[PDB]
Design a protein around this nucleic acid. Sequence first.
DNA 1: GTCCGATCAACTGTAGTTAAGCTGGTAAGAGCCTGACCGAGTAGTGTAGTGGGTGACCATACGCGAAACTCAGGTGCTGCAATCT
Length: 108
Amino acid sequence: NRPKTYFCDYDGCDKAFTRPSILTEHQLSVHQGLRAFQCDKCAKSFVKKSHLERHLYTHSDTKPFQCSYCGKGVTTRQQLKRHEVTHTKSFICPEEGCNLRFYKHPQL
DNA sequence: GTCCGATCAACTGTAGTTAAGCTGGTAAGAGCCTGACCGAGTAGTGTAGTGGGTGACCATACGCGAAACTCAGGTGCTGCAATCT
Ligand SMILES: [Zn+2]
Ligand SMILES: [Zn+2]
Ligand SMILES: [Zn+2]
Ligand SMILES: [Zn+2]
């Protein structure tokens, strides 16, 4: 919506941003080499609250997305969708007019 | 590079060693396809992290209108005085 009208000034940086706090998040993270959210359970650190929140689940068994078929736990919707698509007849015969459909790619 | 000509055997006259397949009953080469076993191949997958854009909520800005507040307009009598009598 609103136009990108805050330009990073550093040598060899191309980026422009919508609102000045975001330009500052970029500058402190990329160019100065500082981060604002530390893991309690390992050495790593993160640039956003949502990124530390994802990393915190990785230290735990009670992972926040749970499979509808097998009940395996995962941390975000992309992982869930890819995993659940393995519980489907995903693959299709690529050859002309052939009707068949398959569950594991080596079968196809 | 070439020159001479000696010299192993090239290409030339006849005297004596090699298969192919018959009768068979037979084990011998060379072989075929299903099956099993591990290495490698095809390639989509499993967590995990960087970035971005959407959405909500805010406040900041002007500009028009709404009510506020200040300061001075306006009403009407009559205490006192002056024109007409
Ligand atoms: Zn930059
Ligand atoms: Zn950690
Ligand atoms: Zn599952
Ligand atoms: Zn087919």
